[PDB]
Write a protein that binds this ligand. Structure first.
Ligand SMILES: [Mg+2]
Lengths: 62, 140, 137, 155, 217, 120
RNA sequence: GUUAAUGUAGCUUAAUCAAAGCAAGGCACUGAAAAUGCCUAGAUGAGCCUCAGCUCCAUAAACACCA
């Protein structure tokens, strides 16, 4: 039933063209979002979920 | 000392007596960036066979939507009948459990929920790096 | 002084309290249909029709005429549903209907109308023109 | 006329009215108004599912107090370029929230309604069913710089 | 007539991936995309692409392509996770990640002295305990793992009575938040199954009516 | 020279006429009536009738509306009624079906705008 | 296996012109609803009998049985 309210569109007169962009968070999952600038892959990063010690450890590992 | 407090309270009361309008929503208002591209749009000239196919597709979708709505309301009514039967059975059995069950739990107020995704999460996945900032507007 | 109503009041059936949970119509034409349905009922108060001649309201008119033809209701319904299904099965009819370009056999329609339901319309037109009132009274 | 039997036939003001703390009694647990929030990056998906939930409430006879939209929350994506020591803009994502407010709801009907919603929940959209509080009421309002400065100087 | 009270849990994990689209749904999705493209004004990308093409054409007789090529190459290089995790195994049915496109329920196996039943997770409670605390204790100690479950309502979900002297069983539904199942090689056998699997497996009539209050989806 | 029922003025529709055309568009059928001042039904054509039902598909649509309009036009011509009044709502007058019904009546010969009364 | 009763579509009509009216869904329009236009599917439970009767199944509340 997840595809119940998905088969829709933008219901306005003046609007830019949007594309089915595949966006990924820090989980590996993908979501389809209508967005300009039709880049196929968008990845959203993270820099604040960790603490200072964890950030320093990640920087050292990098 | 006292005069300053009196003036401060008067200003506070005057500010409180003012209006409480909401923040205008940028979604419902078209930005001025879109007023310079309307005059160049070419037409589509939709043809007859495609019009026929679109009309038939819409009719089929309407019938399918009616059928799925009927199925979904049937499911809701079956669930409601099951719940009503269970509640009546428990009321017939014992009233104290009915009284303690017809209330709401204190752990349902902060109900957070997330839907599914196009792909399952990938194990051992690490983002390279990247920070964030707020670029939203402000209104007073 | 007050006087008790001589019958049921018009808006005394619906519940005054809890109007939010009571269903409402949002359509002026729907209200119009409801109002015209109500206006035809025999109310116990003074009405427009009583003063302006409803012609004694209902009248048991004496029927001096041939019995209606005897037809099988079940067979007629079966044939009518079959005809409707065979018509709806077509696709050229659907295309004409959606394109709003479809004509009607007016002569045919008049033929079946006069065959099945023309006598009743003719009788009511005779009633309106007052033929029976002056021929048999 | 007052003395006639037909008095009050034309009365209509009792048919139309034109001029919420929770109610709990143990068994008729009809608590107060609730706010359902949809958080999404997709205008079409968010609006469509808000329309669907509004239609569901209308069919289920749940009094919809209001149906509005939270002002847009726009976030800028800054990615770290290779070799480090460089932050460059990748793209911009706009977050949108659609809110539907319901008036009354029982425990069993609430359980069924939540079951239906989370069964029909689409992709990439966050559901949040909470109580309508003062913070939620004031969230969709203007800021109070003068008031907060006055409070700061008072304290 | 002695009376017995009995509780049971309908512990349901939601799907993680969406169902495949019906061909009619795909047709409408394509048609909606087509009409949205037609009724759209312009996008900045196509605007600059057209401007660059026109200026190059006018300057030859007197980029956006590179950007889309780079985006396509990045998309091709990037590999997404496998949406299907069961068609490759076809031998592990007790895994939490068995089915990701549908909502599943957990059934455990127990062999009693007199009855060999295909029962759901089940428990008893003293009159001094409540139904919700009983369900919480049952999920905490029967599963023998640290998992988080979300409870929807205190109202009973299903009721079933049987007379031997009679007994009543209340089925209460609950939703998964996150499941960290420890000791997976234990003799106790629990499996995640769908409504079709419930219909196939559940032999008793009392337990075959769970699909009445379980949604089909 | 008959006495038209001047009057109401505060309610709608106006009852100053001799024959009035009324179009009822239900969710399944379309019906068109001509009624006298007393409310009696004079000549009616409905898509519920078998004669139109067997020759017509989708008795609710615009082609059904024009069909019933033309049938009522010929029936009125047979009955001897040439003038009627039609009082639709503002949203109904802009409808596609009833504009076609009015055009069908006009091309069939029945004219709206019932003539003014002599010595009114 | 018993009764006081019925299978008109979700609810009520009608069963001599005719199985109707209200409900329920998609598209256009607005922030959502609502209104309007264009529309979409719908039933006399089934078998024989003369042109209202006998059975089977189903629903609804009670009595024996298995749980
Ligand atoms: Mg018939």
């Amino acid at each position: 039933d997840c595809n119940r309210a998905l088969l829709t569109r933008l219901h306005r007169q003046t609007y830019a063209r949007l594309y089915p962009v595949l966006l990924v968070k820090q989980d590996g999952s993908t979501i389809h979002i209508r967005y300009r600038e039709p880049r196929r892959m968008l990845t959203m990063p993270v820099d604040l979920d960790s603490l200072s010690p964890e950030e320093r450890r990640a920087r050292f590992r990098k | 000392d006292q005069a300053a407090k009196d003036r401060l309270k008067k200003r506070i009361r005057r500010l409180e007596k003012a209006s409480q309008e909401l923040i205008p929503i940028e979604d419902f208002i078209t930005p001025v960036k879109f007023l310079n591209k309307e005059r160049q749009r070419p037409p589509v000239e939709l043809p007859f066979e495609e019009s026929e196919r679109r009309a038939l597709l819409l009719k089929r979708w309407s019938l399918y939507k009616q059928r799925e709505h009927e199925m979904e309301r049937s499911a809701i009514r079956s669930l409601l009948e099951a719940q009503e039967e269970a509640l009546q059975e428990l009321r017939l059995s014992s009233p104290e459990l009915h009284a303690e069950a017809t209330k709401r739990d204190p752990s349902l107020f902060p109900f957070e929920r997330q839907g599914p995704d196009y792909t399952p999460p990938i194990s051992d996945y690490q983002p390279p790096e990247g920070r964030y900032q707020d670029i939203t507007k402000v209104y007073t | 002084r007050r006087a008790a109503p001589l019958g049921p009041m018009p808006n005394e059936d619906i519940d005054v309290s809890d109007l939010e949970r009571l269903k409402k119509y949002r359509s002026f034409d729907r209200y119009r249909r409801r109002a015209e349905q109500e206006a035809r009922k025999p109310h116990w108060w003074r009405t427009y029709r009583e003063h302006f001649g409803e012609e004694s309201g209902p009248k048991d008119r004496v029927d001096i005429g041939l019995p209606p033809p005897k037809v099988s209701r079940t067979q007629q319904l079966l044939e009518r549903k079959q005809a409707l299904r065979e018509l709806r099965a077509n696709v050229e009819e659907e295309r004409a209907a959606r394109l709003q370009t479809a004509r009607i056999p007016l002569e045919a329609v008049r033929a079946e109308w006069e065959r099945t339901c023309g006598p009743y319309h003719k009788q009511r037109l005779a009633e309106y023109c007052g033929l029976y009132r002056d021929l048999f009274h | 006329y007052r003395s006639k039997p037909t008095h009050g036939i034309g009365r209509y003001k009792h048919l139309v009215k034109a001029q919420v703390r929770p109610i709990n009694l143990g068994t008729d647990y009809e608590y107060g108004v609730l706010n359902i929030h949809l958080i999404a990056y997709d205008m079409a998906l968010a609006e469509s599912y808000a329309q669907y939930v509004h239609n569901l409430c209308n069919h289920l006879a749940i009094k919809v107090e209001e149906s509005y939209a939270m002002p847009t929350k726009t976030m800028e994506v800054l990615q770290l370029q290779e070799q480090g020591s460089k932050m460059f803009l990748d793209a911009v994502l706009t977050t949108h929230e659609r809110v539907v407010q319901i008036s009354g709801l029982s425990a069993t009907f609430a359980e069924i309604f939540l079951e239906i919603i989370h069964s029909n929940l689409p992709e990439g959209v966050k559901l949040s069913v909470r109580e309508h509080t003062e913070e939620d009421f004031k969230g969709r309002f203007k800021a109070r710089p003068e008031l907060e400065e006055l409070l700061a100087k008072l304290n | 007539s002695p009376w017995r009270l009995l509780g049971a849990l309908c512990l349901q994990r939601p799907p993680l991936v969406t169902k495949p689209l019906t061909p009619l749904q795909e047709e409408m999705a394509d048609l909606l995309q087509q009409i949205e493209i037609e009724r759209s004004l312009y996008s900045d990308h196509e605007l600059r692409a057209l401007d660059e093409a026109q200026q190059l054409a006018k300057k030859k007789s007197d980029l956006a392509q590179d950007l889309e090529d780079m985006w396509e190459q990045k998309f091709l290089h990037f590999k997404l996770g496998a949406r299907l995790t069961e068609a490759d195994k076809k031998d592990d049915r007790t895994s939490l990640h068995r089915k990701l496109d549908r909502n599943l329920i957990l059934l455990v196996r127990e062999k009693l002295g007199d009855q060999d039943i295909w029962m759901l997770p089940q428990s008893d409670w003293q009159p001094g305990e409540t139904l919700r605390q009983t369900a919480e204790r049952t999920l905490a100690t029967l599963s023998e793992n640290n998992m988080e479950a979300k409870f929807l309502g205190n109202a009973p979900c299903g009721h079933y009575k049987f007379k031997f002297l009679g007994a009543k069983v209340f089925f209460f539904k609950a939703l998964l938040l996150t499941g960290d199942f420890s000791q997976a090689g234990k003799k106790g056998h629990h499996v995640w199954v769908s409504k079709e699997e419930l219909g196939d497996y559940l032999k008793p009539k009392y337990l075959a009516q769970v699909r009445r209050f379980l949604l089909d989806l | 020279v008959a006495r038209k029922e001047r009057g109401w003025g505060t309610v709608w529709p106006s009852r100053e006429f001799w024959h009035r055309l009324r179009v009822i568009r239900t969710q399944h059928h379309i019906e068109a009536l001509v009624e006298h001042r007393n409310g009696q039904v004079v000549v009616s054509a409905s898509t519920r009738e078998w004669a139109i039902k067997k020759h017509l598909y989708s008795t609710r649509n615009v082609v059904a509306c024009e069909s019933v309009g033309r049938v009522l036009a010929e029936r009125c011509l047979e009955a001897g009624i040439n003038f009627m009044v039609y009082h639709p709502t503002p949203w109904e007058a802009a409808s596609d079906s009833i504009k076609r019904l009015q055009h069908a009546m006009t091309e069939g010969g029945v004219v709206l705008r019932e003539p003014r009364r002599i010595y009114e």
